[PDB]
């Protein structure tokens, strides 16, 4: 009689409700609000983004790491510790 047991329909209803939560005007309004907040934060920062995208590794951390790594690797020699680097 009751085929409702083993509820694959009920476990797929979670995915159906998840899909129905978006593609609505509420989610479009939330996306536009997030675009406004992203625009505001991008205008606010403008320096930290350049520091983190250009400076932080290539001109701050990586030279320190390679100099420390080279001095940790090469023997205690004048050529290998000063002149070759």
């Amino acid at each position: 009689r009751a085929l409702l047991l083993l509820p694959f329909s009920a476990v797929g209803g979670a995915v159906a409700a998840w899909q129905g939560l978006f593609n609505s005007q509420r989610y479009e309004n939330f996306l536009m609000s997030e675009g406004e907040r992203i625009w505001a934060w991008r205008n606010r920062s403008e320096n930290e983004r350049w520091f983190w995208e250009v400076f932080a590794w290539d001109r701050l951390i990586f030279p320190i790491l390679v100099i420390v790594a080279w001095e940790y690797l090469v023997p205690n020699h004048l050529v290998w510790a000063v002149l070759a680097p």
Binding site: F22, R26, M32, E34, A40, N43, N47, E48, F51, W52
Partner: protein
Amino acid sequence: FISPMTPYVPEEEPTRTPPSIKDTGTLRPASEWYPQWMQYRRREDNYVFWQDKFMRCSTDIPWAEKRWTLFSTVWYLVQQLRFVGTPPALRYVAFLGWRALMFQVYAAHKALVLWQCKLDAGLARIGSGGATATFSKTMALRRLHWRNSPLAEALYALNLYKTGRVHLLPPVAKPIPRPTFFWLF
């Protein structure tokens, strides 16, 4: 020398962005997109809803919010993880949860403000005998809109408790400026 009556109050540059035109100021969540008063205004005079987005985020940024510091360098990572590092679906469900929680805390604050009005009447009776038993509705709205400092609240409560004078209010608290410590924050 050219003293103009009132002692000259220096007008420093703003350090925080002015609050948005859709704000409520009362800890209640703002509306989703449209602040609902536009329907009670004429069309083509509601141009200042996008003219708040401009000059709140593009053209009138205070220079105290463009300061580069170590704290802002760290905080860029939090904001980047929030915006481009976390999916907008999870951001949306967290936004819904925060909206519901903020509505609940606004209802709690409104009930607390009404109870503070009742306490206002009680303290205004104990201090003026039995004559003054009202309460200041402007002070009620001031408590609701968070325009009062704790010192102002304590001074007003003490003032009620020992002389009455409901309609003698403390000064409105100024907005807190953004703190700056050199290169740290």
